[PDB]
Every structure is written in structure tokens, then in C-alpha cells.
Amino acid sequence: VGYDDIGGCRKQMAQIREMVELPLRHPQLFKAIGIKPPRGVLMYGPPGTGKTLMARAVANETGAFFFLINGPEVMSKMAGESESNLRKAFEEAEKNAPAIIFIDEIDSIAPKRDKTNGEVERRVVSQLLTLMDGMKARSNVVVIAATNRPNSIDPALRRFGRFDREVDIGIPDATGRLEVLRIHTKNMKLADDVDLEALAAETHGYVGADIASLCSEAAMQQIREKMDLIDLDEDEIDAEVLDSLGVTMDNFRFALGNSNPSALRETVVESVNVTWDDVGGLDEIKEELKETVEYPVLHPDQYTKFGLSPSKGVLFYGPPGTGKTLLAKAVATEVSANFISVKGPELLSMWYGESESNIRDIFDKARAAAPTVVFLDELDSIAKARGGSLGDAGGASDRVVNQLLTEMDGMNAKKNVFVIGATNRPDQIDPAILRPGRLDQLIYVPLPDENARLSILNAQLRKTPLEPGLELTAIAKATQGFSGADLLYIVQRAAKYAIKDSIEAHRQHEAEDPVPYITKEHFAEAMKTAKRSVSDAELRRYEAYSQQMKASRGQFSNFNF
Amino acid sequence: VGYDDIGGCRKQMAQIREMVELPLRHPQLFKAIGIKPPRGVLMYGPPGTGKTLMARAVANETGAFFFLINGPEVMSKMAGESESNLRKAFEEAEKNAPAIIFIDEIDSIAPKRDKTNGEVERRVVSQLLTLMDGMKARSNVVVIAATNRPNSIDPALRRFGRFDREVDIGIPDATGRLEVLRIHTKNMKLADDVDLEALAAETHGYVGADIASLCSEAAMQQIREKMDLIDAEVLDSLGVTMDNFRFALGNSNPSALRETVVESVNVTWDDVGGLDEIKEELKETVEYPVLHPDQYTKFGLSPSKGVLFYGPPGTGKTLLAKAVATEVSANFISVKGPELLSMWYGESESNIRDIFDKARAAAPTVVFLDELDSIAKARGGSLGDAGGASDRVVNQLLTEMDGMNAKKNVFVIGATNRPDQIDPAILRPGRLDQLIYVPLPDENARLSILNAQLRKTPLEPGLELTAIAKATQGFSGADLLYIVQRAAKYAIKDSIEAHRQHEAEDPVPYITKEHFAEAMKTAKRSVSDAELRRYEAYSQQMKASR
Amino acid sequence: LSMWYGESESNIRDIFDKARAAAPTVVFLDELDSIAKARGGSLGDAGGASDRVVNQLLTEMDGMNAKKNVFVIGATNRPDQIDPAILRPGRLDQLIYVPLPDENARLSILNAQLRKTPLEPGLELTAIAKATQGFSGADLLYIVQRAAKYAIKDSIEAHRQHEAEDPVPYITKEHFAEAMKTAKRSVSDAELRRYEAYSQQMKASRGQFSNFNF
């Protein structure tokens, strides 16, 4: 490895390189200025960001003596031997030229003494402390540390003299990811069709250890494609096929579509197949949502030139089975940002504060792997009018609602997290979460009109073969009050009658493809039992609430300056 | 056991096969393409799918050294010994030729660091992290893992360089089960009559060791039935019939659902009288998707899933549920009304989601939600705890029955007595498509019910039930059962009287017209006329909406 | 808060110990009604952990300690759930009501939010302020964001046309005329009257008070 291997974080690279090299190459400046350089480094960040790579690069770069100490490598069964090992390590490091000591995974060696209950760990921590800064402290020896959790470290170690400077090796940005792709695809035989800029744009939450995985599995896909039929020879490979090895763009697209960020590996949503062409009607809602989710991600330069932060939240309310969850699925399928899907009460727990912990964890993962789309289905479970729970379940629901409030709008870094909420009873949601800044636009998803119903039918029967003489306009006109679920039910009933006829005809033929498509009589018989899902009283409540929103909205229409 | 022994999962088998074999066989291709291969796998899935079997197969087939590590075997009590054990294992593996390491049940060793109280578990987690990733981490050493709870692992462990790809070794399909049967039944002597294809089609949720259990139980049944019949030549006449396999299949159930098994109750389609139209519609709705998926995929539509029976009490909805559970191939999951609820916070919803997860895992499955009046109710009650949990449960039901899931042939069967109190979002199509009303039987329906109830019992040759059927005009199947019970009780009382008289000094092997007449003079007509008015009003309102 | 027994109060003690150690310190307690609710309300509780937490807060903010200049700031929109003991003077003595903006305050807010945005030379905000009556700062922000969104849309379509063969150097009057037709008031009259009633009950606590001479 070398200095060019670590790419994506030049600032941290320079910050470490300063005290690692300059006081060793030319200390004349420090002797002129009169102050000694820092002699303590703590690299922290999410796993796979490049901490161990930075340590390896420093070891390869410096001509100084290097000493690596793994975390649990020091502990022994004998009482008083771990500290002896630490003492031997530090004395050996100090006896030689100005050396560097790298301590990997320091969360194991050095926990907080107050919270631990054993004795050997406390004694090891005290030995480390006195070795780092005590009488006769150190002699031109620099100590580097790497950790995934800095908060679980003894406060006495997070001090000047022991670990003065803490570098934050964080998630790369678009340019950093482009650098990582260039670094990791510089030694392989690539194809001519590769534009690394598109890949660096479409990859969002990859920590840099996932870029290597993506590249390697893409290469494996390419070799698999060129191996399956061209050369399946267990004995030996002819050289001709080796020279025709270029990892193509289709392979990279496949690799991107399969892989996901390592951070969100737990919360990967199982793939469902919904499409913008699969969602009929709701064209205005479709375009509005597409803009709200695409503009801040595709065009950050525009927002930065205009000096304003994008609108993020959005809530859907309306009668059930109108397309709210379907729109959520379509978004999760064909938006380019990561998706986090949670059901309503899915994050509740019997333990005290554990629901709050889960909410905090999911929103921290969402901002960490941003841009991210978090879908909150059925808000009425987790977010109700605070204080109205006179029957006390311990009041934990109020705490949940408060946590949601101050996690969507509080002391945060203003990262790109968009929240879509979906409910069919908006009146039971707290007013403090329907405010702009959390859920800005409140979109009513109304019952389909005639054209909407016709479009819904065309979308649902996009792939089913149909009779050439069939027309769905009469079906759309006949309903006048149905929903998308009801139209789906009609379609499924027509399918049911068609499959019944097909099966019985095939059975008769075998006893001694007659139906290649659904027919007019099939639709006529499936429409005999058609029913409306939503009554008028529920429709009356929804229209009344929407009219209340219009009263909150209708004061302006269009005004004159 | 070689690769031939492992079967039912081809994609995952190829995934592990290529990584473990091709780099050790022809590294020239990796040298040419200039990328190193992945060197880490975490096999996960439900218990008993064949993860350890595949590990054993690759170990026994590859020429590379294999080192086995068990989960708790490395842990100790002294400070700094478990990490020493791991270091010894890894260094021993790396000292020799390129090798494979297998950490069975890794979830025991390495839980999430932040959510543990001990210290040795944190040290050993950190030791695993440092061993797999670190300065000069590995060289021609491949690591494989096996676990049942992937989410309960340190996220720092689930990264490239430690466990590059997580292969999902899940349950097999119908064809996979076919190959599993063929593999397991390769050494035992079978009879010609039995065909494994029908058995594979009949089994739905059985995975691996479940099929092994089926085969072993069938063989044991054959041995037990022959061993008791008889007191060298016996060995020749050792053959397992189709009846043995049928017995084993009827007595068995998939492991994931074994705790949820229902006590066997014998009911058949002929045991339910009347309701022919509803019975046929239900049969169509149930066996159409499972027996003929080719037609459904040809037409490119999904099938209707949910059904709801409502009507007066006792008319036979739970009887239809029993009949389905007996006479459909799909697995059954019965649940009482409030059976899922709990006093704790956020547990009744966990209960609902676990049962639905198991159902959709062992698909196809029929979940019978009995007495929805309790679970569903109507969202938006009288504020406070009157609705606090009754709304969360309903929302969990809604989002589990429809939303953000993969369609996997799960049919919910409902049963209620006052459907007007059900939340309207539950009744929506796509959740509970069919709203079937099960009315009080008419004259011919009552005749059919009587004939069904009297199927297996002695009857007088000159006895007719038309008078009994016509002389009620307001009864229900429960009331007819009550009449039959009273008639049987009087007949058996007469039989006991005759037997006692004969002892003091079969007299009546059949029930008599006078027995029925004496029993019928005290009838019930349980369903009141107000309940009938309510049900008729609801049904005509539904028809008006229709 | 934590699932274990006593770890909530341990965390509170650690936070306040840090605050008084690195004094002078400012501690912001966001949504005080989440952790500091009136005691005894919970019929069924987790062993009375919330009561223990609020008692810990009470004793630490006023007990057998010193006054090392530590300033507690609370921000809650439901002052009815806060326990009376916390609101005592000497613990949280200043109750500041942040009402809805007036005409000049809406104008000030709009100018504050447009301080880094290019604007049309002839555009005046007095009309927008005069037209938003019941709005809040969040609502004015939403209006501004919608105007920015329409400006970006026009810029994007203009650039698309340019590539097919600054077009929008700054926001115009039209982006507000078209962006304020969907604006709405976040707080209804029910909550407004609830907060007014709360303010007036505190005023009624100040009974028989006027410009009086000693």
C-alpha cells in the first residue's frame, strides 16, 4: 500500500501526516516556534471507512519503527501480566528511533473504569494511563488509535497529552466516492464503456469498504458471464479468453442493483416490483412527489446557489385502498435514494425507553446513509394526540411522539432525510407533527374520477392478455363510486372466471388453449358482485377534513402585489 | 456427504461452490483480471435447512484443510483465554496450506457490543474483528459462518472483508422438495406404487430435516406394522408402501409451525350439509392458486386472498373452517379471538407479526382469524385505554395483511357474529375480499344438514327425515344437532334399560320414529327474531351497496 | 432514559455533573414535558421510573448543591403536562410565552429568512406579511421554500431548452404568487385558544396588580 491508496479523506490525511512526518523530517520549525507537536491520534468513524488502511499507509510510508498492538492481544490469564506486556511493548517502542505505536480496537483495552466491574481491566487502564502521561512521560514516540465507538472510552484517555487530537474519518461525499472508485478500479482490466462519474453519483451511502465489494462482485459477474459458455474447462484455460475480460457497464449496473450500503444491511427491504407505469392516475401527485424527491438530490448546486433548504416531509391521507402504499412502493422502487420501510407499531418494545432507542437508531442510520427515504406507514399507531391518553400505559406513547418531534426537528446537521407518512385517519395525528419543517405538504389522495378509473384499469391490465373487441370505458363509467381496490377485485374476479373456464375445458379435452384471454362475458359475470369499499359517512369525514384544510388554505387563491 | 447429498438449493450452492473452489483451482483468472476474490460468507436462514450439511460437503470435497470452530467451545472463565483460543485456531489454520474455517453458530460468540453487559464477550468480538480485518489479516484463508439470527450480530462484522456476502439458505420450492425426497429415499428399498412427485406437491412448508423426519417415520411405520404381524426371508419382503408415506405425512407438520399445530379434528366436505354455493366458492378460491399457478401467471394477476363469514351463531362457519383445515393442502394456523393479546406494551403487535411471519414463511397457508369482533373492533374508540391498544393492534393487522410485503399466498379466513362493529378498513378488498353471508338453512338445506349429521349411524330402513326437516322452519344446524343428540340419548337409554332387564332376567340396534318424536317435543329455536332482523338489515344494506 | 434500573438517574447526574464542572454552562432541555410530567398520574408504570426521574431532576436542580452558574432552558409546547414543582422560581423562574408574530414580526421573519437569497429588485414583502394573518415562522419558511422550488423548476426547464438548442437569475413575483396558493396555517384556533387560556390563567394568578405606589 501507499499514500495514494487512502482516498476520500484528504483533510484527515493531511492532519495525520503533519504530526506523523513533519516532526520527523524537519523539526527545525518546531524548535523555532518553541512548542512541541501533538503526540496522540484517535481515528474514529463507522466501520470500513479506512482507519486500518490509514494505519497501514503510515507504516508503509514512514521509515520509523512501527509497533502495532491489537486490542485483546495483551490480556493474559496470570494476574499482573497484561500490564507487563504493555510495559514491554512501550519500552521496546521507546528504546528505538522515534517510533509509532498503533493500538487497534481500543474499546476493548480501555473501557471506562467507573462502569466496569472486573479488576484486570481497571488495572490495565491505569497502566496505559501512566504509560501515556506520567512522570517521564515519553520521548519522541507517537501513539495512534482506531475505534468504532469513542464514547465508550475512559475520559482520562480523551485528554491532551494522551490523545490530544481526534480525527473523524467519516463517510465520503460524491467526489470522495469517485476517488475511491478510481483507486479501486486502476489495476483491473476494465472496459472502454465505463463512466465512473455516473457510478459515483448513483452510489449514495457507500462507506468506501462497500465500493471494493461492489467492484469485486461486478468483476465476478463479468467472469461468470464469460465463463458460463465460452470456456468451461476444469483442466486449463486458453489465453485467448483471458484477454477478453472487460467489466462492462451492464455488469456494474447489475452489481449496484444487487448490493446495498453496509450500514443498512440489516434494514434491507425485500424487493417488490412496482413501477411508475404500474401506478395509474394520480399524475399530479406523481410529478409533485418526483420533484420533491429528485430535485434536492440531483441538483444540490441550484439549492446552494439559492441559499435555501429543500422541503422534505409529506403526508398522505384519504380513504383506504386508494394508492398510498402503492405510491410508497413505486417510490422505493424507482427513486435513486435509499429506502427505509417501517410498519406502524413495528418499533415498539415492552422495555422502558427501548422504543425511543429504536426511533433514535433508525433516524441516525437514515441521516448517516443519506439521502434516505423513510416511509412511516400508519402514523396513527405511533403518533397520537399527546395528553389525550388519559388511560395511562405508562405514558410511553407521549415519549414516542416527543422523540419523533425532536428527531425530525432538533439539534441536527440538517442532512437529506425525507419522511413520507401514510394514514387513513389524519384527525388522530398530533398537530405538532403536521407543521411545516416536519411534514410540510399534506396531500389528499381522493377517490378516482372517471379518467382516473380508466387509467387505473389500463395500468392493472397492462400485462394481462385481453380480448381485441373489449373496451374498458363502459366498466369505468359503470362504477362511479369505486376505489382502486374495488377495480382490482373486479379484475381478479374476471381472472377467476377465466381460469375456471380454462381448467374445466382442459379437463374435458383430456377426458376426450381454448381461452387465450379474458372476455366480455367474464367481465360481465365478475361485475355482478361488484361492491363499493368506502361508504359515504367515511367519505363525508374525509371531505369535511379536506374542506377544513381548504379553509386553512382558501384565504389566498391568487392575490395582487 | 458430498455435493450430491446436498440438494434443493442450487443458487446458494453455486455461490459458495465457486468462491471456495475456483480461486483454489485456477487462480490464473484472478491474476489476469487483477482483483482478489471475496473471502467470507455468512450462511443464514431458518433452522434445519442444510447449512451445516453444505459446510460438511464442501469440507469433504475440497482438498484444502478444514478447521471447525464451534460457538461456545472457545469461551472460558479466565481473563484472556477465549481470545487466545481464537488466535491459536486462526494461526494453526494459516500455518498450513490454504484452508477453510467454519464458525458454527456465530451469533452466540458475537452479539452487538453496545447491547451487552459483560466484558469477555466484547473482547472476543473485538478479537474476531481484528483477526478477520487488520494489518496482514489473511492470506489464502477462507472463513464461513452459520447463524439463525443475522440481525443479532454486530454490524461492524457484516461488512466486506469480514463476511463479504450473506447467502440466504431458505426453504425450498416444490421442485427442491422433490430432489430432497429423491436424495433421502435413495438407500431404502421402496415399493413401486408410491410416487414421490405427488408427495413433493403435497408437502408445502417442509424443509430438509423435515423431509428426513418424514422418510424415517414412514420407514418406522412400515417396520412397526410388519414387525407386529410376524412373530432371513423377512428381510427380502421389506418394502415401504404409499400408505406408510401417507400416514407419516398426515401425522407430521413443518418444524416452524409445530408449536402452532392444531389438535386433529375429523371433518370432511360431506360432513357439512347445505351451503353448497359457499362451499364451492371457497374451494375455488382456495385450491385455484395453489394447484394451478401457471394459469394465474399466464394471465398476470394475483388471486383473491381474504374471506369473511358472518351470520347468526352456530350456522356452520367454524365448521367450514374445520373442513378447510382437514381438506386443503395448504398449512393451517388457527387462532382464538383475544388469544394474541398481552398486558405488556408492544407485545400484542409482536404476537400478530410473528404469526404472520411464520404463515408467510411456510406458504401457502390459511390463517383462520376467529372472532374478529375482539381484535378488529372499530378504530377510533372512546379515547384513552379504551382504544390505546385496540388501535395499535388494528394498525399492525392492516399493515401486515396489506402493505410493504411480498405476495406469498396467505389466505385470511374471518369469522364474526356482529360484523357491523368491524373496522371498515379491514373489510376493504385486498384485505378481506369476500363478504359471505351464511344464512339460516331453508327446508332443503336442513334436510341436507340432517342427512350429513346422520351419515355414520344405524337407521331404520323405513325412516324418513323430510318431516323432521320441514317441521322446523326456523332452526339452525346447532338446533338440529341438539335434536339428534336427544334422540340418540333416548335410544341409548332404551338400550341400557333393555340390557339391564336382560341381565336381571342387540335389543335395539337402531333409532326409532318414536324416539325422534319423543326427543323432538322439546326443541329450542335458539336464534331470536331480533337477531334475524338485525342480520337481514345488514345483509340488505350490503346488497343495496352492491 | 434506559431500560435498566437507575441508569436514567445516573445519566441525569452525569450530565448535570459535567454541566457544573465545566461552568459556566448552558443546558437545553428540549420538550421538558417528555421526562418531567406530573407525578402520580400513571396508573400502571415501570416501577415508577418517571417519578424517580423527575424527583432526580428536582433534587439536582435545587438541593444540597452550590450555584455554579448553570442555566436550564426548557422548550415545550404543552405546558400543562409539566409538574408544578419544576416551574417554581429558583428552578425555572422565567416562563416566556412566544406568541404568534404580528405584522412587523412577520415582515422581520421574512427578511431574516431571505437574507441570503437573491430577490427581484421590485419585490416587496409587505403584501405577503399583510396577507398571512395566522401564520407562523414555519409557515413563512414553507412559503419561501415553495417559491424557491418553483424558481428551481423554471431554471431546470430553461437549462433543458438551452441544451436542446442565467435564464432565471433570481426569484420573481410569480414564484410567490404561485407558491402562496397552497400555504396554510399550522396552528388551529383550538390550540390557539388553549395557549391563550393558559396565558390568561397565569395573568389571573397576577391578581389585583396595577401601577401602584408603595
Binding site: K77, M78, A79, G80, N117, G118, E119, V120, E121, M350, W351, Y352, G391, D392, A393, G394, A396 | K77, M78, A79, N117, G118, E119, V120, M343, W344, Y345, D385, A386, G388, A389 | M3, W4, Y5, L43, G44, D45, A46, G47, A49
Partner: peptide, 22 residues
């Protein structure tokens, strides 16, 4: 000569749960 050895295994903790009334 003899020798000593150190060992620190674990302890026992206490959790707190929340219940729902009706």
C-alpha cells in the same frame, strides 16, 4: 514455586419493563 491466576467472569443485572392497563 507456586503461582496465582486472575479470573473475572460476570455479574447479574436488573431490567425494568412497562405494562399496559385497561
Amino acid at each position: 514455586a507456586a503461582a496465582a491466576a486472575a479470573a473475572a467472569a460476570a455479574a447479574a443485572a436488573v431490567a425494568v419493563a412497562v405494562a399496559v392497563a385497561a
